[model samples]
Target: QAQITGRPEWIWLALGTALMGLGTLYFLVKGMGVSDPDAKKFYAITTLVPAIAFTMYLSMLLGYGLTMVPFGGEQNPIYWARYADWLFTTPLLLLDLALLVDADQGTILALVGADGIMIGTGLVGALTKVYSYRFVWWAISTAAMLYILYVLFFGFTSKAESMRPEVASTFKVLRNVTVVLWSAYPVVWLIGSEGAGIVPLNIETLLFMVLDVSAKVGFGLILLRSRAIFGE
Candidate 1:
């Protein structure tokens, strides 16, 4: 009997979109707690908005661009949205890279010794200061935009074997070095910063665990929760 009846897939589609929107809202609110208000606002206007627009445009391109592929259906809107999110968020990787460029060993230690305290404190301070959030958000967005432009011009256009090989090599080395330094800095900082009025590991661990669980399990739970509250 179940096999004979065709289910309305669009219900799932709509539900998924709603869940994504809800998640975005939740993140936005939570992010405000630890983000510069000015930076957040700027990011919302610049990188975030443009990324969203680009994602829509790219999704349309995908559907129309590959019409001959014969995959069937009107195209998965969710997939396209996810791709756009990825396109926009991937720049954070580069931003992480940028943070390490001029950081000496001592600076790296200080950053880590703060046990993410620096980041948390900086975000909190910025939130209170006028235009701090705006400045940070715009700065990050601008940095991301510049990198995106660079990729468009040099990264995407170059041949697979020889597109800015020297620069790529340099980045690879820097990335590896930074990873080691940054990774160790945090663990040591957390250990050292404990008992000095810094945030405890348990709280940090719980926060991360919650984020992971949400990413892995929250989608389905959200759908169920939403349906329970607002039935289809």
Candidate 2:
């Protein structure tokens, strides 16, 4: 990432993007050795979830990537491809929560749909130079994010509480871990990307990079450590 990313992009390249790329591959390799066939299958498949997003971030860091939603900086290319990465990855994560709790397929589908809208609007906003339209798209994305949090805090949390002690404890920690880390995304976006200089791009990228790790690598580690889910 040293020569790969420019000085500006280096902030996040060093911070999280490199780690994301490196960590996903490790997850992929580790997944190959998971003793349980079920756990093995889960990680083997899920490794690509982060793996794909890692590539997108890699591109961004390499200067071929996209923006953080864009305000008024340099060329500020839309970088819509990263949103595609988000769209694909987010549902996989939500599906994990769904499976852990045995959630309704329809409910999981709705959550996935909401995530799609969230990323979609943000991608659109990134392309727009019009401040008003950008704001609209940002607001739409925010609404969708709020919906995710609602389901996370209320829906998932409630379901987890009713599970066996071991499973419930794991689920609760994972939920709190995800929410606590992921909650920073919108704030960083608002203050940094769309903050109109309220937050600097470097700062914005750094914060998001941290969230990227928490959401992807950290999430994977937490899931793998749970004995209840991957039985002996």
Candidate 3:
């Protein structure tokens, strides 16, 4: 039997898309009245991040953003739009943090580039036909993600240290929040449809929903409300 995402799954995706919309609304309205150019930049990126996600989720909810990939002799649906969403949004999220720390252009560029590679390879992993070959792409993607995390923790931390103490503290909190939440993505993928299939598709959708909201919406609230952003 060909597996298509069904009613149970659609509910989760609909709810997720609604959350994405709420985030977009919050950030977009918040960005409108910003005075400082720097704060405006933060609000802009934060607004765009969730706005893009909301668009992708809307497409998925409409059943137009997914494709069936053959695995285990069955047609398994993969949401390519989700990867598309990550490819763009993840780099922006990193940029938000990197700019907060005042990381140099070179380092920021490298970090963003690595994030693209990570997401690109992850999409390939999800789409690959051969079960074993998917793991190969997964390994490559994970390596790129690891490099991104390394730079986030070590490289960005050093740069943030030279800034005002409040900046350093805010950066610390945001970085950890990002690291902890971002790490769950791969684990969810590993256990969900793309990996061992230890869980069902709806579960994967719900889990990713929670993680996405936390990473984007929750992270945005924290970053935008930080004392550093308010110059405290």
Candidate 4:
């Protein structure tokens, strides 16, 4: 963690993690000492947001990126660490979403499982240069992402309908905003290492930095505000 490459790319991600880390801490402050278990879980899981950023960027400083096998005996020259972070953090975020909507436990697990596969395959997809493997894996993750959205959009609401009027609105609004906020991941991933080299790595880091702050820190602010509305 103390080590640094000092490359602009390194500095970029480091700078990103610092701010997001602070944001994570700031957002999580509200969760502390709260009497409500519901709010406790919300802020607690959301805390994982910037913590993932810390892992994602700091790990990069160590190995240039996360370790991965390129072929049988070889490793990727440029490893992708964010996959580890995503695989860990994304589900927590989804579970938070499920909580907001009061989705069934089974349904929540199902969604989180799909997300696991998404990050799992997405990691392998990023590692390979083979066009077919990469495309198929990416396709699988994309399909899962779509399903996640479908659940949030259509499936989640069915359950929400049974809840209090304020709860229902909280779920819909938060769910909608979350879906919108999260949509940028793929776009940034595309440019980062997942898809085309539409943007440089430094720029990709910048984009991801902004996305993390918005999705995690900025979203946390909103979630805390809504406690007043739902008061659940």
Candidate 5:
């Protein structure tokens, strides 16, 4: 039998969906006056992140995004939609950062590829029934995340810092925002239902929603506001 999601979870799912939709519209409206082609392209990516997340969260709100997984002699409801959201949005987020830094095509490809691997392994870990096997997948996923961090901090940061001072400053702020908030995701997964089951599923949903809004919406706003990235 599937685990029952409570009313609070339902409310949060609806709220998340609404927030993503609002974010998408916000980016779209803000991008309208952007005359530069480069800025336009960045706007499109920013818009897509929340647009895709809106759909995913809407699916979750409708109760189609979760599944029951067996773990440690109990069944837990895993919100597969969250992983789906991250799989799409995370790469776009990385692309946003990489392109801002003028990273070469190869570096961008590798970053997105590594991010894909991280999300894929994370999903596998979430779905695995055995605790030990689940953790093995988690370790692999964490390593991939570490690789992404290495590339962002060492490769992308250095490249950006070599540019105009404003550009470098903007990069640092957004990059730190991305790094700090992103680092919380793994910890949330570890202590949430998919791992030790210390946090309730509803609370987990709320926590992730907060992170998602900060990472996606907040990041988008900052990226758009940066005149440095627009060649000002």
Candidate 6:
């Protein structure tokens, strides 16, 4: 058996720390908005739960991936690496189930608060009819465009050290760039509110379908590919 070295462990720990840090930051920014009376219940639940789970999972995945990379044998490293992925994802599944079962009262509270806000806002919108379908579409399109711009700018600005040293440095740069571009779509829909153009219904339904398909089919494919390669 090959002895594990401290250097590899430290690298994994650092990557894990970075993932957790970013996740925490996202939570702080997006999760606290549950206080809003206008927020949608279902939207909040979907975003909050997935955000938490993926954040934790990614943190563990990157940590484990970093650790196992040093071990030379492809099969053994791959097997153990998969175990590490489970270590992160399994707990998230349990937490998600607990949320569903009402075992996590805090999650329930947030959900209730979010639902109340959504319903209240919806009632107000119905009564006033202040928001229009065209406005919503423009909002979504604008937001997407802005996000694409941000990704182009910020992704280039903030680059992490290469996880794989032998891979071309350009790969690392491109990878981060891709993350920024990938993240832009949701942000566009969220901040832009351009839902009215594509669908006959309100922004809520349109946004839901766009986000679900984009995230699951689009981004999920990327994740699946990564898992295949990384043995996650």
Write candidate 2's Cα lDDT for 114-171 as tens digits: 9989988887776787666777888889889888878977888778778767767877
lDDT of 5 by residue, 1-232 (tens): 3334735588888888889898898888777776787777788888999998999989888878878887787777888988999999999999888878888999899999999999999999999988889989988998899889888887788898798787788889998998889888888888887787688787888889999988999998888888637542
TM-score of each: 0.25, 0.86, 0.95, 0.82, 0.95, 0.26
What are the RMSD figures for all models against the true structure?
A: 22.6, 3.8, 1.5, 4.4, 1.6, 22.5
lDDT of each: 0.32, 0.71, 0.86, 0.70, 0.85, 0.34
- Residue 59 of model 4, lDDT score: 74
Q: Where's the lowest-lDDT run of ten residues in candidate 6?
A: 70-79
- Give the candidate order by descending TM-score: 3, 5, 2, 4, 6, 1
User: Please, what are the lDDT tens digits per residue for candidate 3 over residues 1-232?
Assistant: 5444755688878988999998898877766666777887788888889888999988888988878899867888888889989999999999898778888889888999999999999999999999889989988998899899999998889888888888888899899999898888888898887777788778998999899888999999988887535432
lDDT for each residue of candidate 1 in 58-161, tens digit (9 for 90 to 100): 44334431111111121111122322333433333333222313224453343343323333432232232232242443344334334433433344223212
TM-score of model number 5? 0.95
Off by over 4 Å in 6: 1-128, 132-149, 152-199, 202-211, 227-231
Flag clash pairs in model 4.
none
- Judged by lDDT against the true structure, how good is candidate 1? 0.32
> Which stretches of candidate 1 lie above 4 Å from their native place?
1-9, 31-68, 71-82, 93-232
Give the C-alpha lDDT of model 4.
0.70
Give per-residue lDDT, candidate 3, residue 60: 85
Index of the highest-lDDT prediction: 3
Best by TM-score: 3
Query: lDDT tens string, model 4, 138-216?
Result: 7787888889888888898888788778768767777777788777777776655345546655676667777766766
